[PDB]
Short mmCIF file of C-alpha atoms and ligand atoms in Angstrom, two decimals:
data_model
loop_
_atom_site.label_atom_id
_atom_site.label_comp_id
_atom_site.label_asym_id
_atom_site.label_seq_id
_atom_site.Cartn_x
_atom_site.Cartn_y
_atom_site.Cartn_z
CA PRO A 1 101.73 121.35 177.08
CA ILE A 2 98.38 119.78 176.53
CA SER A 3 96.23 120.82 173.66
CA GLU A 4 92.37 121.68 173.81
CA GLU A 5 91.89 118.70 171.51
CA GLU A 6 93.95 116.49 173.75
CA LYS A 7 91.93 117.55 176.68
CA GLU A 8 88.73 116.55 174.90
CA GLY A 9 90.02 113.13 174.41
CA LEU A 10 90.83 112.54 178.19
CA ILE A 11 87.38 113.93 179.01
CA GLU A 12 85.69 111.42 176.67
CA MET A 13 87.89 108.53 177.88
CA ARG A 14 87.14 109.39 181.51
CA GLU A 15 83.52 108.68 180.82
CA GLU A 16 84.04 105.92 178.34
CA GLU A 17 85.83 103.80 181.08
CA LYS A 18 83.01 104.61 183.47
CA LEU A 19 80.47 103.20 180.81
CA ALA A 20 82.39 99.90 180.89
CA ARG A 21 82.51 99.78 184.83
CA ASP A 22 78.79 100.84 185.14
CA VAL A 23 77.40 98.42 182.50
CA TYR A 24 79.56 95.55 183.87
CA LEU A 25 78.32 96.21 187.53
CA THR A 26 74.75 96.36 186.28
CA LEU A 27 75.16 93.07 184.41
CA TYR A 28 76.93 91.47 187.42
CA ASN A 29 73.99 92.36 189.58
CA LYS A 30 71.60 90.67 187.05
CA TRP A 31 73.45 87.60 186.13
CA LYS A 32 75.97 87.16 188.96
CA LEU A 33 78.75 85.94 186.46
CA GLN A 34 82.08 86.68 188.26
CA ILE A 35 83.57 87.91 185.02
CA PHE A 36 81.47 91.11 185.10
CA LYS A 37 82.52 91.83 188.78
CA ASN A 38 86.18 91.16 188.07
CA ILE A 39 86.32 93.20 184.91
CA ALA A 40 84.31 96.05 186.46
CA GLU A 41 87.03 96.30 189.02
CA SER A 42 89.61 96.64 186.27
CA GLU A 43 87.41 99.32 184.59
CA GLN A 44 87.36 101.17 187.99
CA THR A 45 91.22 101.13 187.79
CA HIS A 46 91.00 102.53 184.18
CA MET A 47 88.68 105.30 185.41
CA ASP A 48 91.27 106.20 188.23
CA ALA A 49 94.08 106.26 185.58
CA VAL A 50 92.28 108.77 183.39
CA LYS A 51 91.28 110.81 186.52
CA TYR A 52 94.98 111.07 187.43
CA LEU A 53 95.70 112.73 184.16
CA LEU A 54 92.73 115.01 184.36
CA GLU A 55 93.97 116.19 187.77
CA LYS A 56 97.58 116.40 186.46
CA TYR A 57 96.38 119.16 183.97
CA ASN A 58 93.51 120.43 186.19
CA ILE A 59 90.99 119.56 183.56
CA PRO A 60 87.47 119.56 184.96
CA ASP A 61 86.13 116.05 185.47
CA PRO A 62 83.16 115.19 183.45
CA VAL A 63 82.25 112.63 186.26
CA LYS A 64 80.29 115.03 188.61
CA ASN A 65 78.35 112.00 189.92
CA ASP A 66 79.89 108.55 190.34
CA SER A 67 76.55 106.82 190.52
CA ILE A 68 76.01 103.95 188.03
CA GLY A 69 74.38 105.19 184.87
CA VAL A 70 75.15 108.91 185.26
CA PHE A 71 77.05 110.64 182.52
CA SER A 72 77.75 114.14 181.33
CA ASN A 73 78.27 113.33 177.63
CA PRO A 74 75.02 111.96 176.55
CA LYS A 75 76.73 109.53 174.08
CA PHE A 76 77.52 107.43 177.18
CA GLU A 77 74.11 107.80 178.62
CA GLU A 78 72.50 106.46 175.51
CA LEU A 79 75.10 103.63 175.29
CA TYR A 80 74.46 102.69 178.95
CA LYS A 81 70.71 102.40 178.47
CA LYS A 82 70.98 100.58 175.26
CA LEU A 83 73.63 98.05 176.46
CA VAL A 84 72.03 97.32 179.80
CA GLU A 85 68.74 96.60 178.09
CA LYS A 86 70.35 94.21 175.52
CA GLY A 87 72.35 92.62 178.26
CA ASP A 88 69.32 91.95 180.41
CA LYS A 89 68.00 89.46 177.68
CA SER A 90 70.28 86.46 178.57
CA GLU A 91 73.77 85.55 179.83
CA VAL A 92 74.90 85.28 176.16
CA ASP A 93 73.59 88.76 175.33
CA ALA A 94 75.25 90.16 178.52
CA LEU A 95 78.56 88.61 177.41
CA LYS A 96 78.20 90.05 173.90
CA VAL A 97 77.68 93.42 175.52
CA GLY A 98 80.99 92.87 177.44
CA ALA A 99 82.79 92.37 174.14
CA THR A 100 80.96 95.28 172.48
CA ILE A 101 82.09 97.81 174.99
CA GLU A 102 85.72 96.62 174.78
CA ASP A 103 85.45 96.61 170.99
CA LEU A 104 84.38 100.31 171.19
CA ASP A 105 86.97 101.19 173.71
CA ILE A 106 89.77 99.76 171.48
CA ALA A 107 88.49 101.69 168.37
CA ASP A 108 88.08 104.92 170.35
CA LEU A 109 91.59 104.56 172.02
CA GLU A 110 93.19 104.05 168.55
CA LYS A 111 91.54 107.25 167.40
CA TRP A 112 92.75 109.36 170.33
CA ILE A 113 96.23 107.70 170.37
CA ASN A 114 96.64 108.88 166.67
CA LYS A 115 95.74 112.39 167.82
CA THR A 116 98.48 112.75 170.32
CA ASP A 117 102.36 112.93 170.77
CA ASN A 118 102.31 113.29 174.58
CA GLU A 119 104.12 110.17 175.85
CA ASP A 120 102.33 110.26 179.13
CA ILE A 121 98.93 110.39 177.58
CA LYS A 122 100.04 107.61 175.24
CA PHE A 123 101.48 105.17 178.06
CA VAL A 124 97.99 105.40 179.60
CA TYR A 125 96.01 104.99 176.37
CA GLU A 126 98.22 102.03 175.35
CA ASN A 127 97.79 100.40 178.69
CA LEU A 128 94.04 100.93 178.69
CA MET A 129 94.01 99.46 175.14
CA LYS A 130 95.92 96.34 176.31
CA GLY A 131 93.42 95.97 179.10
CA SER A 132 90.47 96.08 176.76
CA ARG A 133 92.14 93.48 174.44
CA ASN A 134 92.54 91.22 177.43
CA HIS A 135 88.98 91.88 178.60
CA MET A 136 87.60 91.12 175.18
CA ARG A 137 89.55 87.84 175.05
CA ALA A 138 87.93 86.92 178.44
CA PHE A 139 84.40 87.80 177.33
CA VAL A 140 84.78 85.96 174.01
CA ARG A 141 86.09 82.90 175.66
CA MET A 142 83.23 82.89 178.13
CA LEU A 143 80.78 83.38 175.06
CA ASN A 144 82.49 80.26 173.50
CA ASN A 145 81.59 78.34 176.71
CA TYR A 146 77.98 79.11 176.19
CA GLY A 147 78.21 78.03 172.42
CA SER A 148 78.46 81.45 170.94
CA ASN A 149 80.90 83.92 169.55
CA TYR A 150 81.32 87.65 168.75
CA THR A 151 81.03 89.77 165.72
CA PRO A 152 83.17 92.90 165.85
CA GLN A 153 81.31 96.24 165.40
CA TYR A 154 83.91 99.04 165.79
CA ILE A 155 87.39 97.68 165.23
CA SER A 156 88.25 95.86 162.00
CA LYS A 157 87.58 92.17 161.45
CA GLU A 158 91.47 91.80 160.96
CA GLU A 159 92.25 93.36 164.21
CA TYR A 160 89.53 91.31 166.04
CA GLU A 161 90.87 88.03 164.77
CA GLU A 162 94.46 89.05 165.82
CA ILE A 163 93.30 89.68 169.30
CA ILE A 164 91.11 86.47 169.83
CA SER A 165 93.81 84.21 168.19
CA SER A 166 96.41 85.30 170.64
CA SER A 167 96.91 84.72 174.36
CA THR A 168 96.14 86.96 177.18
CA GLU A 169 98.78 89.63 177.52
CA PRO B 1 46.17 83.91 203.39
CA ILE B 2 47.47 86.59 201.16
CA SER B 3 45.28 87.78 198.33
CA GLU B 4 46.46 88.56 194.69
CA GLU B 5 45.79 92.15 195.32
CA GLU B 6 47.62 92.20 198.59
CA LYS B 7 50.63 90.51 196.70
CA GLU B 8 50.45 93.25 194.09
CA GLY B 9 50.81 95.98 196.79
CA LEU B 10 54.04 94.29 198.22
CA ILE B 11 55.52 94.05 194.74
CA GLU B 12 54.90 97.81 194.16
CA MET B 13 56.28 98.75 197.61
CA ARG B 14 59.32 96.61 197.20
CA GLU B 15 60.33 98.82 194.25
CA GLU B 16 58.89 102.10 195.65
CA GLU B 17 61.49 101.70 198.58
CA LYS B 18 64.11 100.95 196.06
CA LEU B 19 63.15 104.28 194.16
CA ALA B 20 63.77 106.24 197.35
CA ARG B 21 67.14 104.43 198.11
CA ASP B 22 68.40 104.74 194.51
CA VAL B 23 67.47 108.39 194.11
CA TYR B 24 68.94 109.38 197.49
CA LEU B 25 72.31 107.46 196.69
CA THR B 26 72.34 109.23 193.30
CA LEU B 27 71.84 112.64 194.97
CA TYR B 28 74.37 111.80 197.68
CA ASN B 29 76.94 111.23 195.02
CA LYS B 30 76.22 114.55 193.43
CA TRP B 31 75.90 116.88 196.29
CA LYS B 32 77.54 114.90 199.26
CA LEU B 33 74.98 116.08 201.70
CA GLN B 34 75.00 113.47 204.58
CA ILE B 35 71.25 113.48 204.77
CA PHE B 36 70.97 111.61 201.45
CA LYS B 37 73.44 108.87 202.58
CA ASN B 38 71.77 108.45 205.88
CA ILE B 39 68.26 108.34 204.59
CA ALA B 40 69.40 105.98 201.79
CA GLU B 41 70.50 103.55 204.38
CA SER B 42 67.11 103.79 206.05
CA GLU B 43 65.53 103.04 202.60
CA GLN B 44 67.68 100.02 202.19
CA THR B 45 66.24 98.89 205.59
CA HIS B 46 62.80 99.48 204.17
CA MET B 47 63.64 97.47 201.02
CA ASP B 48 64.76 94.59 203.18
CA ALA B 49 61.52 94.81 205.28
CA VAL B 50 59.40 94.35 202.14
CA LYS B 51 61.68 91.61 200.82
CA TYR B 52 61.19 89.63 204.05
CA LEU B 53 57.37 89.62 203.37
CA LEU B 54 57.83 88.68 199.83
CA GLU B 55 59.97 85.74 200.83
CA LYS B 56 57.48 84.84 203.62
CA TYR B 57 54.75 84.31 200.99
CA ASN B 58 57.17 83.27 198.23
CA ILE B 59 56.17 86.04 195.89
CA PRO B 60 58.66 86.69 193.11
CA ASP B 61 60.83 89.65 193.83
CA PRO B 62 60.36 92.46 191.28
CA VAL B 63 63.95 93.45 192.07
CA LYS B 64 65.84 91.15 189.65
CA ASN B 65 68.79 93.61 189.56
CA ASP B 66 69.65 95.64 192.67
CA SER B 67 71.71 98.12 190.62
CA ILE B 68 70.79 101.81 191.15
CA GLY B 69 68.19 102.92 188.71
CA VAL B 70 66.96 99.46 187.50
CA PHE B 71 63.24 98.76 187.93
CA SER B 72 60.74 96.04 186.71
CA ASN B 73 57.63 98.33 186.97
CA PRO B 74 58.33 101.31 184.63
CA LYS B 75 56.40 103.71 186.91
CA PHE B 76 59.63 103.66 189.02
CA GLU B 77 61.95 103.85 186.22
CA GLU B 78 60.29 107.00 185.02
CA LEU B 79 60.21 108.47 188.47
CA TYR B 80 63.97 107.68 188.98
CA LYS B 81 64.89 109.50 185.78
CA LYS B 82 62.60 112.41 186.39
CA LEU B 83 63.70 112.90 189.96
CA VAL B 84 67.48 112.50 189.56
CA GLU B 85 67.32 115.08 186.65
CA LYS B 86 65.35 117.53 188.81
CA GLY B 87 67.64 116.91 191.84
CA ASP B 88 70.79 117.54 189.77
CA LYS B 89 69.84 121.27 189.37
CA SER B 90 70.71 122.54 192.90
CA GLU B 91 71.03 121.39 196.62
CA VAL B 92 67.62 122.91 197.14
CA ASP B 93 65.99 120.97 194.33
CA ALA B 94 67.73 117.76 195.51
CA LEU B 95 66.22 118.33 198.97
CA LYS B 96 62.76 118.97 197.41
CA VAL B 97 63.06 115.70 195.56
CA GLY B 98 63.90 114.02 198.93
CA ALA B 99 60.49 115.33 200.30
CA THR B 100 58.70 114.52 197.06
CA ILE B 101 59.58 110.80 197.30
CA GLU B 102 58.58 110.57 200.95
CA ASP B 103 55.34 112.41 200.11
CA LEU B 104 54.57 109.80 197.35
CA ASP B 105 55.62 107.00 199.77
CA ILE B 106 53.11 108.15 202.38
CA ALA B 107 50.27 108.56 199.97
CA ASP B 108 50.86 105.10 198.46
CA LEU B 109 51.31 103.39 201.75
CA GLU B 110 47.87 104.85 202.80
CA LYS B 111 46.34 103.46 199.70
CA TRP B 112 47.82 100.01 200.30
CA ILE B 113 47.11 100.03 204.13
CA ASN B 114 43.37 100.67 203.28
CA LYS B 115 43.34 97.65 200.94
CA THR B 116 44.50 95.09 203.65
CA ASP B 117 43.49 93.43 206.94
CA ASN B 118 46.63 91.31 207.36
CA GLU B 119 48.25 92.55 210.52
CA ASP B 120 51.74 91.57 209.54
CA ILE B 121 51.38 93.51 206.16
CA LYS B 122 50.00 96.44 208.27
CA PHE B 123 52.88 96.54 211.05
CA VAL B 124 55.33 96.82 208.19
CA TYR B 125 53.30 99.45 206.12
CA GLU B 126 52.84 101.48 209.22
CA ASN B 127 56.40 101.32 210.26
CA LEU B 128 57.39 102.29 206.72
CA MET B 129 54.90 105.11 206.79
CA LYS B 130 56.30 106.38 210.15
CA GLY B 131 59.80 106.22 208.70
CA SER B 132 58.71 108.40 205.56
CA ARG B 133 57.06 111.00 207.99
CA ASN B 134 60.36 111.24 209.86
CA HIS B 135 62.34 111.42 206.63
CA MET B 136 60.06 114.07 205.29
CA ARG B 137 60.57 116.24 208.37
CA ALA B 138 64.27 115.88 207.97
CA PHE B 139 64.28 116.87 204.22
CA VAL B 140 61.96 119.84 204.99
CA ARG B 141 64.16 121.03 207.93
CA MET B 142 67.17 120.91 205.76
CA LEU B 143 65.21 122.85 203.00
CA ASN B 144 64.35 125.48 205.67
CA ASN B 145 68.12 125.81 206.37
CA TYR B 146 68.58 126.72 202.71
CA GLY B 147 65.72 129.35 202.93
CA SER B 148 63.21 127.13 201.15
CA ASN B 149 60.18 124.97 201.99
CA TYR B 150 58.14 122.25 200.45
CA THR B 151 54.73 122.10 198.76
CA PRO B 152 53.04 118.79 199.03
CA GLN B 153 52.03 116.88 195.87
CA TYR B 154 50.41 113.44 196.80
CA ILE B 155 49.28 113.71 200.45
CA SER B 156 46.89 116.26 201.48
CA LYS B 157 47.87 119.83 202.61
CA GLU B 158 46.24 118.94 205.94
CA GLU B 159 48.35 115.87 206.47
CA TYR B 160 51.58 117.63 205.36
CA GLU B 161 51.12 120.36 207.90
CA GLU B 162 50.37 117.87 210.66
CA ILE B 163 53.74 116.02 209.81
CA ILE B 164 55.98 119.11 209.70
CA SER B 165 54.45 120.86 212.75
CA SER B 166 55.23 117.80 214.87
CA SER B 167 58.42 116.38 216.15
CA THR B 168 60.51 113.49 214.83
CA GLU B 169 58.74 110.24 216.01
MG1 MG C 201 88.80 99.96 180.10
MG1 MG C 202 60.89 104.30 202.81
#
């Protein structure tokens, strides 16, 4: 059976995946780079994966309003506002914001994975983590096309270099 | 030819119609009352009408990002945040917010109509105004179904009572 603390992590990840979908839809609509629309769709899949686990355990869904930008945990509301404002400044800053959210996602997924032995909760967290590694590689390669790069913020420098120096999984 | 001041009014109305669409899509997604989805669609039509005039005169569109909640004029950003928070409290408060935005829209359309002799700009402002009267009647009748009513904020009491005491146009 699921612990109260394990429930808290699914409730955070539910909205954390929604932060990524909503910022990437918002930055698609500003810059019309296909990467944001494609990765947004992947984040909608990740949101649906967390929702399936919330419904499995009948945990109340923190997403009471699917609209872009709406969050129950104000951590994610603050991140949405900060990151859409930064991403609005240029294509390069929007792509950096892409990488930033995946970086956060990987760091937070490692924290929650280390708090659980439930193999079903772990399959999903590991899958989401692999997705965020792939997405990070895609945002960083597109940053390189614009003559830029990315400095990790939440994961370690060692882990970031392991991700970017390896191929899409 | 269009004046600088007439251009300013189309630029404000472009986003004012977007405020109504975006708040009503946000409140649809919270409460799932069909009125919000139906009227949102009408507001998308009103946004497109203003856009046609902006493109006729090659005026830069203040909507650089169609995403819900994004605005160039921070008047509309502040109104969006205030009104989605109020509308989140109950169905009655969401329906009051419906009426509030139409009320504002009618008051602002009267201000801009009185600033112009361009008959093309006026056909559109009058049509939009008629739409907002109709929408107001619909939100107030739905408020009545919930045992509530609406107090006008921007238009006069006399004008509000003329609108609600008459039939859909
Ligand atoms: Mg994700
Ligand atoms: Mg309208």
